[PDB]
Amino acid sequence: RTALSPGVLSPTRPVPNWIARPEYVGKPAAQEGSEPWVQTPEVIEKMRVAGRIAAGALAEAGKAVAPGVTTDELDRIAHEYLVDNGAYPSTLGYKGFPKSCCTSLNEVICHGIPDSTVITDGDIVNIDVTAYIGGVHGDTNATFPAGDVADEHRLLVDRTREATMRAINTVKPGRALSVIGRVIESYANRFGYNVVRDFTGHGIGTTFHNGLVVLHYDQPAVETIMQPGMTFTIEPMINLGALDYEIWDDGWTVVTKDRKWTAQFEHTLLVTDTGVEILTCL
């Protein structure tokens, strides 16, 4: 199947003027990066709502995944589910991003921009949706197969999902944050895959990327200890090929240099008093 090329971006989709926009919409940068990593009880409850709605949107767009569809259509669907439930699509107008979710087909590592690109039999596509409601964000993504996908790619998708769940299951207060990337990388190397290092998980709360960074590879130099109330994402990108990548001119779409396919899964997590809670579930 031919390497991907830019489709054509449809016009900015509108969102009900009554839905509160995050502060960064229409601005070159976002006011984020120094927020507390441990959330207040009020923010955690609100994040359960944001998480649930982003999870619903992801699942709706996922069902439209099929040979014949454009990535733009996936965006249309996710956007509509968000607005219908009173949430602003966090990516819309974030640092200039033009759409409501990221659609990353095949060799696109992440941040693909929904467009006219038509999905073909055999492709894989990650859909990443973020919801902003009640002043907080919920972030989640998954890779969906389109039509008859080759074994190599189905195995990649399933093993990336599994790596993600294994990392989530290690989350607990008192455990070193670095355990997450150690578990992910060890599992992916078991199958000869390479874990993307330049892109990471992140703390999230009243801000989209609040400054906390969660690495998906082995990096024991990090000393951060998980604490009850901390909220962050685990969102590993796992490559069949080399880690080398290119960023298109649109400034967002990241594509592997060797064009080999890559897969990603993401959830927003809460560190509870004794373990973990996945907030981005239906």
Ligand code: MET
């Ligand atoms: C175009 S911004 C996309 C951000 C993505 N939802 C994340 O997990 O950080």
Ligand SMILES: [Co+2]
């Ligand atoms: Co995301």
Ligand SMILES: [Co+2]
């Ligand atoms: Co994220």
Ligand SMILES: [K+]
């Ligand atoms: K991909």
